[PDB]
Structures are given as structure tokens and as C-alpha cells.
């Protein structure tokens, strides 16, 4: 925003908004497989209790 | 504002020893959190609200 | 933090990323399901007496 | 009689505008019957950020508070000098295109503002840069 | 193409009620679906084929 003109900062930046947002997504996605993996564990602890 | 390096944030007191040379801190985020203000040769610690 | 990690310290981005829709919206619901759900699994495992 | 009138009483309130997000309940004819303004109360947030005018008991997520900055502080370097600008775009004689010469500038302030005054100027098109933003930043070299 | 208004559907005889402003109905998906006639005010209703 201190380097580029606003007509087409917008096109530089969508290139970055994109990628992160993106990125929050395979972490989100991670996180649901791996707590489906925890819960599949931990209700095989619960019946051993 | 230090020499065009916009952000929002606190200024602390810092201990980190910076090379002549150095004048840029960064983090494992790999963006710039300790600086050096240009009058003096102190340097100042950046950290998020 | 959707809004933040994303565009942190830039107002102009956190109103580009506004028109982006509904997706930030979508991962605090989603991760919030795994986040209680842990308060239940332990709950489960060891709350039987 | 032009000077001195008995008029009745008369009230008027007058309020301004604010840009605020507000949730508005169309009725099943259409009009406004019940509306919530987000930014009032937490009680306010929570109804607007779950679509819903009732919400059950139970603990809520909503915006993330955030401290906003209470001044704004420039620092710069101390010296205040003047770059030789004006005598390369005043220099009587230039060298040929095939022997370009190339100047050091530096340990300088430089004020681009002058030089967008000069009416004979054809080419200004900074790629890298906005035109505009070579007054508020630093040039290494 | 009511007013600029494009779209495609079969219009019926609509049983919803339009107050004199209101121009344009909108489903919860967020979508036109009753047009009034510029020439007749009886309300249309737009739904696809």
C-alpha cells in the first residue's frame, strides 16, 4: 500500500490474499481429520474404562 | 513509521545486541519486528497490540 | 483469528477481505465443533462414577 | 407588522447517521418489524453474529477485540540535505546513449515535488512504485 | 429482462402481497423471484424452468 498504485494493488494483492486464505483451509481441514481420529481413539478408550 | 516501515504496534526496550550492519529483527514469521530508529542507535522492539 | 492472520494491521485488506463473503465466519464454527469436543471426550472417558 | 409574530409551540429532534450493520426482521408482509443494531451491546453482537433475534443459554463467540493505535510517530534520519536533482535535469550537455553515465545519490533528501512542476516533462510512469508515494519513502540507493 | 433485470423462468400469478415501494422479491437464497409489470402492477413470479 506504500508501493503500489490502488487501480492495481488490488490485482497484486488478491494473488496474496488468495494463497493465505487458502492456506487456512488445509490447516482447517488437518484439524477436522486429525480430531475425527482422536474421537475414534477416544471412545476406544471409553469402553476400556 | 521507521524509514517507510508502516505497522501497528508497541515499542519496547530491547536487549538483542544488533550487528553494524543490521538493522532489520524478524521472527520464524520471517517479517520485521526489531529496528533500529535512524537518530539514535538504540534498538527498539516491535511487537502486535 | 480469520481477519486478522490474514490482514493483520491493514484496514484497506480487512475490508477486501469483507466482500470475500462468508469464509471467515465458516472456520470459527468449524474449528469451534473440534474445540468442544474435547471438553466431551474427556468428559466421556473419565466422567463414568 | 412585518416585525413581531405570536406562533404556536413546535418540537423537532434531530439526530446523525452512523455506517453500523444492522439485522432486520421481514415480517411475512414484508415490512420492518423488528430490527438489532450490532455495535450497541454484547447482548446486541451475540444476536446479529448467530442470524437469530432468540438465542438459547449457553457460552457465544463474536468479534475479536482489538486496541487502536492512540498516536502515530515518523522517524526518519537526521540529515537534511538537498540531492543533486535539479543540475541532472538541468545539465547543460548529456552524454550519448551508448555511453551512459551513472551517478552516485545519496546522504541526500530528495523532493520529487519540485520536479513534477516542470511542464516539458513527457515520460512519468513508475512500475514498482506509485508516482505519488516518492515523497513518504526511504531510498536506500 | 425486467428493467435490466435479466433472468429465465416461467412466470405465474403471485398470492404475495408487494407494498407500493417494494419492487423486487428475494428468496432466503438470496435471489430475485417476483417482478412487477411496469405496465400492469399485478406481481409476477419468477421461478426457473
Known amino acids: 500500500f506504500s508501493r503500489l498504485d490502488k487501480v492495481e494493488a488490488e490485482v497484486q494483492i488478491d494473488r496474496l490474499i488468495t494463497g493465505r486464505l487458502q492456506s487456512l483451509q488445509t490447516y482447517v481441514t488437518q484439524q477436522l481429520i486429525r480430531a475425527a481420529e482422536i474421537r475414534a481413539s477416544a471412545n476406544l478408550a471409553a469402553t476400556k474404562m | 513509521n521507521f524509514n517507510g516501515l508502516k505497522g501497528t504496534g508497541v515499542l519496547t526496550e530491547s536487549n538483542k545486541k544488533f550487528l ?22 538504540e534498538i527498539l522492539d516491535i511487537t502486535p497490540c | 483469528d480469520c481477519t486478522m492472520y490474514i490482514c493483520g494491521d491493514s484496514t484497506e485488506c480487512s475490508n477486501l477481505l469483507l466482500q470475500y463473503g462468508s469464509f471467515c465466519t465458516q472456520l470459527k464454527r468449524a474449528l469451534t465443533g473440534i474445540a468442544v469436543e474435547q471438553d466431551k471426550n474427556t468428559q466421556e472417558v473419565f466422567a463414568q462414577v | ?69 492512540t498516536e502515530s510517530i515518523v522517524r526518519f534520519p537526521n540529515i537534511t540535505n538537498l540531492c543533486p536533482f535539479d543540475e541532472v535535469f538541468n545539465a547543460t550537455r548529456f552524454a550519448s546513449v551508448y555511453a ?21 516533462f513527457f515520460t512519468f510512469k513508475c512500475y514498482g512504485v506509485s508516482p505519488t508515494k516518492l515523497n513518504d519513502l526511504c531510498f536506500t540507493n
Open chain 4, 100 to 120: 551512459w553515465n551513472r551517478k552516485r545519490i545519496s546522504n541526500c533528501v530528495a523532493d520529487y515535488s519540485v520536479l513534477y512542476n516542470l511542464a516539458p
Open chain 4, 1 to 69: 407588522s412585518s416585525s413581531g409574530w405570536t406562533a404556536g409551540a413546535a418540537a423537532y429532534y434531530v439526530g446523525y447517521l452512523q455506517p453500523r450493520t444492522f439485522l432486520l426482521k421481514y415480517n411475512e408482509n414484508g415490512t420492518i418489524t423488528d430490527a438489532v443494531d450490532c455495535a450497541l451491546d454484547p447482548l446486541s453482537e451475540t444476536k446479529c453474529t448467530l442470524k437469530s433475534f432468540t438465542v438459547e443459554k449457553g457460552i457465544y463467540q463474536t468479534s475479536n477485540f482489538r486496541v487502536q493505535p
Open chain 2, 20 to 41: 553494524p550492519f543490521q538493522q532489520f529483527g524478524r521472527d520464524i514469521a520471517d517479517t520485521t519486528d526489531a529496528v533500529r530508529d535512524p537518530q539514535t542507535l
